[PDB]
């Protein structure tokens, strides 16, 4: 596959492990 | 170069082994000092050495190149150490 | 002072071709594996 | 370092907290910026 200036990156609800469980 | 009375001096030293032609490589010129002279520079000269064992003097063996800069757009590629490794003329 | 060197010979200013010379640091900003 | 306090550097003025690093600056450079054009690395003027 291919920081504190007011740009907040939120984590998703489902992580990378929960994608593989589905 | 002179930027509003602040004179900038860039320098680069590398060993070579040639006669006439410049190498087909790349080098980054780092700044050495900063001289706030506050004056305008339009002409220049170059110091040369002479010897005699002011008209019967004899010079040694050296050469230099004089170029002209142009305000064009250039790219700067930096490595992990923070040095310029490549340059792209647009 | 005003005496010129009489052992000089006037030669035509021939030119050469440079490859990638003439690149310096425009500022004092540190970078790391980026391109500007 | 290790405290969010106000700083006034040569190329950055504001509040920040300094941490340890392993970078190597050039002897003519005084501060460094990231890809986002934000100053995040400076140099001590007395200690190397």
UniProtKB/Swiss-Prot annotation, chain A:
It comes from the Viruses. Subunit of the fusion protein that is processed upon entry into the host cell. Mediates fusion of the virion and cellular membranes by functioning as a class I viral fusion protein. Contains a viral fusion peptide that is unmasked after S2 cleavage. This cleavage can occur at the cell membrane by host TMPRSS2 or during endocytosis by host CSTL. In either case, this triggers an extensive and irreversible conformational change that leads to fusion of the viral envelope with the cellular cytoplasmic membrane, releasing viral genomic RNA into the host cell cytoplasm. This is Spike protein S2'. It comes from Severe acute respiratory syndrome coronavirus 2 (2019-nCoV). The gene is S. The chain holds residues 826 to 873 of 1273 of the full protein.
């Amino acid at each position: 596959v291919t920081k504190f200036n007011g740009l907040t990156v939120l984590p998703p609800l489902l992580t990378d492990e929960m994608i593989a469980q589905y | 170069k002179n930027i509003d009375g602040y004179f900038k001096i860039y320098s680069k030293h590398t060993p070579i082994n040639l006669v006439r032609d410049l190498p087909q490589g790349f080098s980054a010129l780092e700044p050495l000092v900063d001289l706030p002279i506050g004056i305008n520079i339009t002409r220049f000269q170059t110091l040369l050495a002479l010897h005699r064992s002011s008209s019967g003097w004899t010079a040694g063996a050296a050469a230099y190149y004089v170029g002209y800069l142009q305000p064009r757009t250039f790219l700067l590629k930096y490595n992990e150490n923070g040095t310029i490794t490549d340059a792209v003329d647009c | 002072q005003c005496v010129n060197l009489t052992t000089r010979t006037q030669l035509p200013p021939a030119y050469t071709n440079s490859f990638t010379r003439g690149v310096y640091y425009p500022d004092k900003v540190f970078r790391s594996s980026v391109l500007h | 370092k290790n405290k969010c306090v106000n700083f006034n550097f040569n190329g950055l003025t504001g509040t920040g907290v300094l941490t340890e690093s392993n970078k190597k600056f050039l002897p003519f450079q005084q501060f460094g910026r990231d890809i986002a054009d934000t100053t995040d690395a400076v140099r001590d003027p007395q200690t190397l």
